[PDB]
Design a protein around this ligand. Sequence first.
Ligand code: HEC
Length: 104
Amino acid sequence: GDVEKGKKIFVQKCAQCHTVEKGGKHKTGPNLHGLFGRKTGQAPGFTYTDANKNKGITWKEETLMEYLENPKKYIPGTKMIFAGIKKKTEREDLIAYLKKATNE
Ligand code: HEC
């Protein structure tokens, strides 16, 4: 989608859990510090539930789409609470922002 709207919209409904624009600790969501290429399923501290811990994926521009669209389906019992995104644009916008969140 856009990258800027991704960031804006993200902060509008994601940052509450994922404040990835400062030294925001892993409270209700891990700070998205790399994401693309950064194999999950193994954090140094808050490594989430078993359900996510058990996954071990490289958070590519495939699995992010799957997750953000249908997170409860992608992972059957995460602590993430996000049943739907918007329609389609937001699914592409958020995932475009994070494609630069890996870099900023
Ligand atoms: C709090 C109720 C949440 C909201 C709102 C959002 N997310 Fe989230 N997310 C949440 C938890 C508890 C977890 C842990 C599971 C895990 O796999 O770490 C996550 C995880 C993610 C991840 C992966 C993190 C990683 O492994 O590096 C992504 C990519 C992610 N969440 C993105 C994301 C976005 C863009 C959100 C707004 C649409 C969003 N999350 C909201 C909890 C919560």
